[PDB]
Amino acid sequence: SGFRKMAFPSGKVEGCMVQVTCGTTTLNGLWLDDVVYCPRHVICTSEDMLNPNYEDLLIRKSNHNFLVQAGNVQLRVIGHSMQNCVLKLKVDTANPKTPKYKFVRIQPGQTFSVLACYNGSPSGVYQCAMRPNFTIKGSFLNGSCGSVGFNIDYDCVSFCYMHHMELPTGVHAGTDLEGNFYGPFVDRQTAQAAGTDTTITVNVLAWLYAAVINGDRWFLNRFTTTLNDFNLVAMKYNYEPLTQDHVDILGPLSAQTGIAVLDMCASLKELLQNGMNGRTILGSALLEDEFTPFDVVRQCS
Amino acid sequence: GAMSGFRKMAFPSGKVEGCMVQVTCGTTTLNGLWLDDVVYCPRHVICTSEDMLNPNYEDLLIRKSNHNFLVQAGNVQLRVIGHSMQNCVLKLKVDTANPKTPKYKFVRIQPGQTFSVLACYNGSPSGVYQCAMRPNFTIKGSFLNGSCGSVGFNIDYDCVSFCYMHHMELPTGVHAGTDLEGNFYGPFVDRQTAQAAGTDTTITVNVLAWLYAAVINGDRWFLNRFTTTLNDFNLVAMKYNYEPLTQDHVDILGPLSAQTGIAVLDMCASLKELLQNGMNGRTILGSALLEDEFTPFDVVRQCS
Numbered sequence: 001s002g003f004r005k006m007a008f009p010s011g012k013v014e015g016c017m018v019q020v021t022c023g024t025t026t027l028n029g030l031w032l033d034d035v036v037y038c039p040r041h042v043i044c045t046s047e048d049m050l051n052p053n054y055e056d057l058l059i060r061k062s063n064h065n066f067l068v069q070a071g072n073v074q075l076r077v078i079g080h081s082m083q084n085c086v087l088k089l090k091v092d093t094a095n096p097k098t099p100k101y102k103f104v105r106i107q108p109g110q111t112f113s114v115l116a117c118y119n120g121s122p123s124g125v126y127q128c129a130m131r132p133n134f135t136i137k138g139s140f141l142n143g144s145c146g147s148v149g150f151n152i153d154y155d156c157v158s159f160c161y162m163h164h165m166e167l168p169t170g171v172h173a174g175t176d177l178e179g180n181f182y183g184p185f186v187d188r189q190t191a192q193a194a195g196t197d198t199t200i201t202v203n204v205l206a207w208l209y210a211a212v213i214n215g216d217r218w219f220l221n222r223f224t225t226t227l228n229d230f231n232l233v234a235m236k237y238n239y240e241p242l243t244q245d246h247v248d249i250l251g252p253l254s255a256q257t258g259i260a261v262l263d264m265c266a267s268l269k270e271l272l273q274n275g276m277n278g279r280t281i282l283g284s285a286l287l288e289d290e291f292t293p294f295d296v297v298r299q300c301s
Numbered sequence: 302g303a304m305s306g307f308r309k310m311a312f313p314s315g316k317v318e319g320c321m322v323q324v325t326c327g328t329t330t331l332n333g334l335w336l337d338d339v340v341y342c343p344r345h346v347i348c349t350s351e352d353m354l355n356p357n358y359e360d361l362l363i364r365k366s367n368h369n370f371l372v373q374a375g376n377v378q379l380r381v382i383g384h385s386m387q388n389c390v391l392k393l394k395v396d397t398a399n400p401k402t403p404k405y406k407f408v409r410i411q412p413g414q415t416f417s418v419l420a421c422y423n424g425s426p427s428g429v430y431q432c433a434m435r436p437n438f439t440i441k442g443s444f445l446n447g448s449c450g451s452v453g454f455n456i457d458y459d460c461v462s463f464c465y466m467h468h469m470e471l472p473t474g475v476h477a478g479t480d481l482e483g484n485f486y487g488p489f490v491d492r493q494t495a496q497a498a499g500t501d502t503t504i505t506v507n508v509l510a511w512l513y514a515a516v517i518n519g520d521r522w523f524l525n526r527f528t529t530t531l532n533d534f535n536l537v538a539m540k541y542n543y544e545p546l547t548q549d550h551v552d553i554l555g556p557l558s559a560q561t562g563i564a565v566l567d568m569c570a571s572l573k574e575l576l577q578n579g580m581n582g583r584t585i586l587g588s589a590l591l592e593d594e595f596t597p598f599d600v601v602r603q604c605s
């Protein structure tokens with residue numbers, strides 16, 4: 001018993017963090033093989049960062065512009081290129097601490113760990129989910145530009161996120177490791193705000209399934225709803241609509257607890273309309289939405 | 302501001318990952334901590350299921366030889382050249398010093414203080430989380446199976462301060478353990494006899510540090526114009542199962558009080574009203590819950 005949210009052990013990622021400096025700007029880079037990955041906005045001054053031509057500003061930088069430092073050892077840039085919003089700096093030295101790794105792109109509602117870094121130094125690690133509005137909750141004290149998000153599967157690190165900027169609303173925004181932004185954001189000093197966030201409905205249901213596996217059962221009722229009717233009530237409460245895909249992902253938990261997905265959806269619809277009336281689920285008075293169905297399957301199976 | 306939307310973080314775990322090993326005695330398998338040429342693990346690794354109600358560890362240990370213990374780091378078998386007991390922690394000397402040994406200390410923590418736990422299974426790091434030593438001397442840990450010997454730690458200036466090792470799960474869902482010198486936190490014993498955690502309380506000094514942090518970051522809806530006496534506050538607080546506040550904790554919040562202009566007992570009056578009215582969907586620093594697992598030490602350093 002006991003459901004604590006956990007981040008992946010960060011050691012494999014710690015051995016890849018470096019410090020990247022262009023002019024006055026300093027931020028974190030990801031050193032894998034003989035390439036350092038970092039946000040492309042490190043080559044911008046105050047003049048440039050309003051509507052910059054990144055590819056034109058980038059060719060006109062040499063290789064020695066870039067100050068790459070890994071501990072006390074300065075890595076030697078022997079080439080640079082751009083891939084969407086990530087700058088790629090090929091260096092002369094392969095990282096001997098390079099782990100088994102992959103670049104993957106995740107979907108809103110999926111969870112990963114972030115290794116918060118400052119000036120290339122790892123400061124802390126936390127578990128989070130990609131919000132439905134494609135932002136990640138976190139403060140200025142939860143990593144600066146170039147900190148990465150990742151999952152670990154087997155012994156392989158799946159890099160899925162790189163932090164590019166902190167929005168004023170206590171959330172940050174970024175890209176995958178191929179430079180494609182998550183959400184309608186641009187790497188520019190312009191008026192940018194996150195849309196209205198919603199609650200990740202499939203994750204709440206995963207969490208309610210976890211509560212049932214830990215014998216927290218008071219909220220279960222004999223009723224079922226339709227996917228159509230559940231969605232009607234869900235959106236009124238700023239919950240995400242549930243898709244038939246989400247229903248299928250929840251399949252294994254339904255088979256392991258005996259609670260059909262639309263059976264559990266009736267309990268969650270009741271929770272939304274009446275609250276918990278002074279009760280708790282898994283020890284919390286609030287519904288958790290940063291546990292994927294697979295997070296529960298790992299921890300509770 | 303700086304801490305708008307702050308999430309709690311564990312320390313980067315890599316330095317501890319390098320010290321985790323698997324310790325087996327007979328058919329019992331759990332985690333050990335490999336520092337220099339010593340492996341530390343719970344002493345009940347030497348117990349059978351029948352020993353667990355009333356193990357005589359001194360008796361069980363003297364019947365063990367160095368070759369009773371199987372220590373494994375990855376695919377490498379470490380060879381035990383000695384064993385001794387320090388309180389509830391078993392200490393296995395091995396013939397190989399851990400080349401990944403970080404700079405480290407053994408420290409005992411008080412309730413309310415925070416640290417990270419590297420949850421491990423079969424010597425293998427599985428996950429990491431940040432927590433506080435609860436006032437009832439337990440920690441709320443992961444689902445678990447065989448995470449005994451997982452350690453809790455702080456990192457400061459690349460030196461790892463080891464403060465906790467997991468020993469047992471109480472019937473409540475919470476966990477109990479020792480410092481790295483083998484002394485339990487709280488009144489628990491490493492036996493399978495009927496043990497129950499006391500009624501847990503909210504760490505009030507940590508809540509007040511959190512509310513102060515919210516004020517530095519411009520989140521001010523919960524402040525009132527009232528103040529209170531320390532003993533009027535403690536009368537109300539304990540009725541909400543909040544931990545009593547001492548002059549020590551008043552002093553500890555002193556820097557935050559000076560940085561915001563809000564006297565500690567002023568904030569206490571604000572907290573008293575929060576407990577009265579409740580946060581009912583309203584958020585502080587982006588969190589819909591009164592956080593009690595962030596210490597005044599961390600707030601002052603993150604809000605210079």
Ligand SMILES: CC(C)NC(=O)Nc1ccccc1
Pocket residue numbers: 005006007125126127128307308309310311429430431
């Ligand atoms: C509750 C919100 C902030 N999320 C987290 O706390 N993730 C996290 C995971 C492991 C250790 C510390 C934190």
